[PDB]
Amino acid sequence: IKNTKVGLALSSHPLASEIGQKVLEEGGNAIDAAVAIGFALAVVHPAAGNIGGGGFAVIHLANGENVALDFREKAPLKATKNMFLDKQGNVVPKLSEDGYLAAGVPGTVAGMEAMLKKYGTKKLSQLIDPAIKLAENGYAISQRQAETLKEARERFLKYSSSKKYFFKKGHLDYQEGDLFVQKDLAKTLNQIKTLGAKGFYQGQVAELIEKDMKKNGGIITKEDLASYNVKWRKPVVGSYRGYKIISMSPPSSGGTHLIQILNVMENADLSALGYGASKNIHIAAEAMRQAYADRSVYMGDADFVSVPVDKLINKAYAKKIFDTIQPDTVTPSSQIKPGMGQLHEGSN
């Protein structure tokens, strides 16, 4: 895969990738193409591509600036700390995983619009058309999609809505090659085409969301949808062997631990022994071990809790981690202390 003219737009589904690449061919910028792909994947890759979830965009601008878009889902207005526990204080099995109470307030649609408004050059009406076309006219189920649909069967069967949308008549599994048409989805997408984000978060679609939630024990209402907000944030930034790393800040832990782990690894000359050497794997894996321990205590939505991002990505902390790595020997997880005695702000 190569290009020397308009760049590249790459995703996990060739139809979606084609859509973004087209946007680049016609003169849209990376943000424009990013938006078209976001909606296309919502149609052609329903296991993960979505309008009912959320995510992050990390953006580097032609003028040199970096910005992060947080369109992560929010816990509903009525969510509570122990909402998934029983009266004994134990987890209610599957309550956090299956059904309507498992859902945070979707951010994807608000996120697509926000980045387009701020940094795009094209109109949402143009960028959403290919998605609507795929929804309305359909596409062929792939070998892999047939496999994932079958795996999800018992989960879909619990919900009348899903039994309608993701099976053929008679509740039959979609097979490789079958035409998959999603007209209700096309209807929802048309509302966003006409009204923008307000087409999802207000009006008829918001009503549909509130209604189905109330019918099925969810707590999301029109109020939660009206209250959904994206946040523009500073990405987390670091360096590795002269290269600048720009990644996602809280409420992702991803960028912070990525930078932290590379910071540890930077203290070894990995290049000396090359790919796949056990000595190299050991440095990385022990760095990972400390990072995920740190994650369990120090990471969350920074808007709501104190998150020591700068300390976690500090190369001096990484050097302390590297020094704790015993040659030719692991430190079992049982012995790992989150923060390594370095992330204490007094007795807090």
């Binding site: 979830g53 992050f56 990390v58 321990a293």
Partner: protein, 186 residues
Amino acid sequence: ATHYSVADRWGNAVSVTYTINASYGSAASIDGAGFLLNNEMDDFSIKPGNPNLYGLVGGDANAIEANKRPLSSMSPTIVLKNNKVFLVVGSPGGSRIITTVLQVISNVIDYNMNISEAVSAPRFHMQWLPDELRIEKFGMPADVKDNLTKMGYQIVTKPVMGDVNAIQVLPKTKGSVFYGSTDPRK
């Protein structure tokens, strides 16, 4: 989750990972609207020390509060070289995202792999709990497994990790050449 990467001719790069969490999310769709709901609530810590779908644990910091965003591991990333776009990279994989992405970056910077080689290279994974070194089929030969086991790792072979869609941008005598790789695991 699914990751997509975009880089344009003016020097913009956009790295996006987005998700309904589990495969098909919560498995429940909004009737009349045709889309699946996320199960992103499971990315909170729902009880202290309780492992979630990806074996991740927490306490206070990632406890549920109304309107709070559940902690993610999504790592959409951009690497710069001399202040120019060099890599655009990310992956799905829940807890495995962070280690997948950093391995692809390391393969380029430390080992001088091209983006295709860097994406196709076998991946390993350690996330503290469970205390295991997770590897891929055919990913680690006996000699390497033996030496790591002697260090004290418990090695386990599990299904392939991640689905990287990445771009590598290189300067040409005039302008840029954009290289892309999808993931052979997908």
